[PDB]
Design a binder for this molecule. Structure first.
Ligand SMILES: Nc1nc(=O)c2cc(CNc3ccc(C(=O)N[C@@H](CCC(=O)O)C(=O)O)cc3)cnc2[nH]1
Ligand SMILES: Nc1nc(=O)c2cc(CNc3ccc(C(=O)N[C@@H](CCC(=O)O)C(=O)O)cc3)cnc2[nH]1
Lengths: 182, 182
């Protein structure tokens, strides 16, 4: 279980149901590269996300491509269009990926948001990895990311695929960090 | 929804976790064809059966080849070796069925028993068909097939792919029947 997020200096992850920052095409490309790249031959990654984060993808790249898109919601009676699966819980969704028909087709599981999903997932006993993009500037948010507990999480000073130096796009600097827990 | 069973004259379907009769090679040929045959190319049929059924299949005929095997178990921890999916009630299995990625891989649904399942499936709202092979002889049994509500089910005088003649094998006579409900 991998969590993938981009957060501002203020820990905001959202505003009005959108990234509180203007589009970083490279930041996007990387998110697109991590959640897609599967380690195993012929296996696919599964992304999980709440109702809101699904509606927040530009309608034209829904469902994420080359990925199994699952959506959690206790409300929705059926998978919103383009969605691959639907679960009411993070557990139920974790179970399902445990069905062997499934298990033999999925490699990595990535949690893409929103807030309460990241919350439920961060707590979940088990081996968890947090891929966080530090967007080094404040932005006006309505939704935030939780405190990464240092009792539990450790920052990997290294990570195959991820560059260590500070990035910049449209006068915005950011850096990719990787935390782990067990 | 398709249910497929064989019943002795006394409505028996099992004796000590086995069929009450000796094996009718040509009746197992029928159940096989019917359950394995899909209308669509690149789609497969799904078989749902209780745990006892699962186990009454000769362990080298497990799981049923060319079919997605699904196990109904309230307690079973994880899915028995070789089963494709595990659910806890007909309900989840069916729901499981309407999952978009699932739904495009699966053509027909067949309920292969046991008593408790047949029954739940029989009552269930919708368009249901029972495929009944009437074994024209009494056999001591411990498991009995729910009795068919004539008020709801209706015998179809013919139905494509169903031989109309009384059959006999090993001196035993049987007949193929199909019931429908709306
Ligand atoms: N690093 C990181 N960046 C994000 O932008 C991000 C966004 C979410 C949640 N929201 C979204 C919203 C839209 C798209 C999206 O359009 N993804 C496309 C974009 C790739 C591209 O178009 O260049 C994808 O194909 O992955 C993804 C996540 C979660 N974790 C993230 N994590
Ligand atoms: N018509 C009918 N006949 C049955 O024998 C039957 C059996 C069950 C449950 N039990 C069983 C037990 C064994 C096998 C089985 O070995 N099937 C194999 C091989 C058939 C053959 O040997 O020709 C398969 O490939 O289906 C199937 C169902 C439920 N509905 C039925 N319905």
């Amino acid at each position: 279980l991998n969590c993938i997020v981009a957060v501002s200096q203020n820990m905001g992850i959202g505003k009005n149901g959108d990234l509180p920052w203007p589009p970083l095409r490279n930041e996007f490309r990387y998110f697109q590269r991590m959640t897609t790249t599967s380690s195993v031959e012929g296996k696919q990654n599964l992304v999980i996300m709440g109702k809101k984060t699904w509606f927040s993808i530009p309608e034209k790249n829904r469902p994420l491509k080359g990925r199994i898109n699952l959506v959690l919601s206790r409300e929705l009676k059926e998978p919103p269009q383009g969605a691959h699966f639907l679960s009411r819980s993070l557990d139920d969704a974790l179970k399902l990926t445990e069905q062997p028909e499934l298990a033999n087709k999925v490699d990595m599981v990535w949690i893409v948001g929103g807030s309460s999903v990241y919350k439920e997932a961060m707590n979940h006993p088990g081996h968890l990895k947090l891929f966080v993009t530090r967007i080094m500037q404040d932005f006006e948010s309505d939704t935030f990311f939780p405190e990464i507990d240092l009792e539990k999480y450790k920052l990997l000073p290294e990570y195959p695929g991820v560059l260590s130096d500070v990035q910049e796009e449209k006068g915005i600097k950011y850096k990719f960090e990787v935390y782990e827990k067990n």
